[PDB]
UniProtKB/Swiss-Prot annotation:
Activated by cell stresses such as DNA damage, heat shock, osmotic shock, anisomycin and sodium arsenite, as well as pro-inflammatory stimuli such as bacterial lipopolysaccharide (LPS) and interleukin-1. Transmembrane segments: none annotated. It comes from the Eukaryota. The active site is at 165 (proton acceptor). The gene is Mapk14. The TXY motif contains the threonine and tyrosine residues whose phosphorylation activates the MAP kinases. The lineage of its organism: Eukaryota, Metazoa, Chordata, Craniata, Vertebrata. It comes from Mus musculus. This is Mitogen-activated protein kinase 14.
Length: 334
């Protein structure tokens, strides 16, 4: 009922994993934690093992750890990371310190993409399609990514694309500053900046700070109009913006010159300052740009997700217990 674990130290980090996972090779590390490629002897496929960094060092971390485990256990969709296994070496809650997450190995991300490129750039269509397909699903459970960027989006040798861990270059201007009650469509903005970057090769808005970032966004999409200024509840921001010289909305065809005109039409519908006017994932899939891949019979919505815990205010030992309960109750895919 409990497997056999084995110790291992990979550049100054303790890896204690069940013996079914072999040939652990580091692929990267950061704030999220440490990830290793590995061979799963049970299923026989290549997996990625993530060890959470300092999972219970504060109420923020402990709650963040619980959040990630709850989200990842909920996601059943081809364009979103699924959990194959979650485990801890600890035999009880008393000594429960570390958490490991297991998903199928993804060779690269949207920064890399050399396995998918062709001269026509018909790869872009398939890559953005998969993002929107996974966003529709995520957004259907009232989940918003917020920090969507090319390193968040994994890709295989087959150019299958998946989202994971839910600069400021791709951040929707409404959440850089906070004018209105920011909705799902913050992510559609990030897809805009990503798509554009895949079509030109250059970062669309490579701003050096929150000042420079809003300067570069307004250069392209023009300063807020009469009807958008109205809906900004923050005086700081309404002062910030009205104090700046009026910029006109540029012609997208002239900016994105030599790119599929169907792509330009989609960009124009993604990069609007007004979140209420901006295209949804569900709508964007139906855009003619994706006519090849689109199918409303195989673009599914997620089951309802219980986000009631986000409001709740508990101690680290309480989150840890709630986290521990989610590891024990885990069941893999059939
Ligand atoms: C800091 S940057 O945004 C960033 C954050 C997380 C990850 C990142 N997190 C994972 C990862 C691994 C296992 C899990 F169970 C969950 C997530 C992977 C992963 C998954 C499969 N094959 C290769 C790598 N990459 C990569 C980059
Ligand atoms: Mg990685
Ligand atoms: Mg999934």
């Amino acid at each position: 009922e409990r497997p056999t674990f084995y110790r291992q130290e990979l550049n100054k980090t303790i890896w204690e994993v069940p013996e079914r996972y072999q040939n652990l090779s580091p692929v990267g590390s950061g704030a999220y934690g440490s990830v290793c490629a590995a061979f799963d002897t049970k299923t026989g496929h290549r997996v990625a093992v993530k060890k959470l960094s300092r999972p219970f060092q504060s109420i923020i971390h402990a709650k963040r750890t619980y959040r990630e485990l709850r989200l990842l256990k909920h996601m059943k969709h081809e364009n979103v990371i699924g959990l194959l296994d979650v485990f801890t070496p600890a035999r009880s809650l008393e000594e429960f310190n570390d958490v490991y997450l297991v998903t199928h190995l993804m060779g690269a991300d949207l920064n890399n993409i050399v396995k998918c490129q062709k001269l026509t750039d018909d790869h872009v269509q398939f890559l953005i399609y998969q993002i929107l397909r996974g966003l529709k699903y995520i957004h259907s459970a009232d989940i918003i990514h917020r920090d969507l960027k090319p390193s968040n989006l994994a890709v295989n040798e087959d150019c299958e694309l998946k989202i994971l861990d839910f600069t400021r270059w791709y951040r929707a201007p409404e959440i850089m500053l906070n004018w209105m009650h920011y909705n799902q469509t913050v992510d559609i903005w990030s897809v805009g900046c990503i798509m554009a970057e895949l079509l030109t090769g250059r970062t669309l808005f490579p701003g050096t700070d929150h000042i420079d970032q809003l300067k570069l966004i307004l250069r392209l999409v023009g300063t807020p109009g009469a009807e958008l200024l109205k809906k900004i509840s923050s005086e700081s921001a309404r002062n910030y913006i009205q104090s700046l010289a009026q910029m006109p909305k540029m012609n997208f065809a002239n900016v994105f010159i030599g790119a599929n005109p169907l792509a330009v039409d989609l960009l124009e519908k993604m990069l609007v300052l007004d979140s209420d006017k901006r295209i949804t994932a569900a709508q964007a899939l139906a855009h003619a740009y994706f006519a090849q891949y689109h199918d409303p019979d195989d673009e599914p919505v997620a089951d309802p997700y219980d986000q009631s815990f986000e409001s709740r205010d508990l101690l680290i030992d309480e989150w840890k217990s709630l986290t521990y309960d989610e590891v024990i109750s885990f069941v893999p895919p059939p």
